[PDB]
Every structure is written in C-alpha cells, then in structure tokens.
Design a protein around this ligand. Structure first.
Ligand SMILES: [K+]
Length: 137
C-alpha cells in the first residue's frame, strides 16, 4: 500500500475548478456576509512556491492579494483574507500541506494535497468542511 509525497509537487499555479461548502465554512469562520458571498464569486488562482524549508502560498483575486511565507513547522502570525489574525503553522504531513490556524479559542485547518495532477484543498472549522479543486494552470 505504498505512497510517497513531497512538498514540491504542489509547486505551480492552480486554477479553481470546483467547490463544495465554501460559503458555509466561511460562515463558520465568522466571515461577514459581503466578503462571504463576494469571496465565492471570485475564481482565484492559488500560487504555491518553495525555497527548501521555506514555503509561500499566494491567493490572487482580481481585486485582492493575500500572501504568507514560512519555514515549515515554525509558528508565524497570519493576516487571513478575511482579516482574522491567527498564529499559523505549516507542515507537510501524510503527503499534504497542512495549514493549522489558531485564533481566540477557535481554530481551523486547510490541507492541500496533489492527487492525479489536481490539487485538492479541504478546509475545516469546528465541523464545517469545504473542498475546492484546483487544476494546474
Ligand atoms: K513531513
């Protein structure tokens, strides 16, 4: 039952092909209605790059840019696209980029995994999971 994954196959630019439950996970995060339904109308490209241990995930909408960098495993502060201020940590575990965010008791996860050349992106907050499929541009 052999598998292997490596951080660098997630490198490249990723077009959103698909989405299930996004608007709800965002409601769970406390995303205001305007940014919630507007965010869903945006078809953003996820752009991932890495320099060894150091990773950068960029999110581009036509009208915004949010971006973070980090050495994997080290806690770092994050300005999420919706204004949340989290203490984030990124690891590569079980063949996936894992982004754990913590903010005021509450917390969330975003896992990014290469699967058949597609990047599968599942977000989880307090039992509200979303999945979004990006294709390689
Ligand atoms: K690992």
């Amino acid at each position: 039952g052999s598998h292997m994954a490596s951080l660098k196959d997630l490198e490249g630019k990723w077009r959103l092909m698909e989405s299930h439950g996004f608007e709800e996970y965002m409601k769970e995060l406390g995303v205001g209605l305007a940014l919630r339904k507007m965010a869903a109308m945006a078809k953003p490209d996820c752009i991932i790059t890495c320099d060894g241990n150091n990773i950068t995930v960029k999110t581009e909408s036509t009208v915004k840019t949010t971006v973070f960098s980090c050495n994997l495993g080290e806690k770092f502060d994050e300005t999420t696209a919706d204004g949340r201020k989290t203490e984030t940590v990124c690891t590569f575990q079980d063949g996936a980029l894992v982004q754990h965010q913590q903010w005021d008791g509450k917390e969330s996860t975003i896992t990014r995994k290469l699967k058949d050349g597609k990047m599968i992106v599942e977000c989880v907050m307090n039992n509200a999971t979303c999945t979004r499929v990006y294709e390689k541009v």
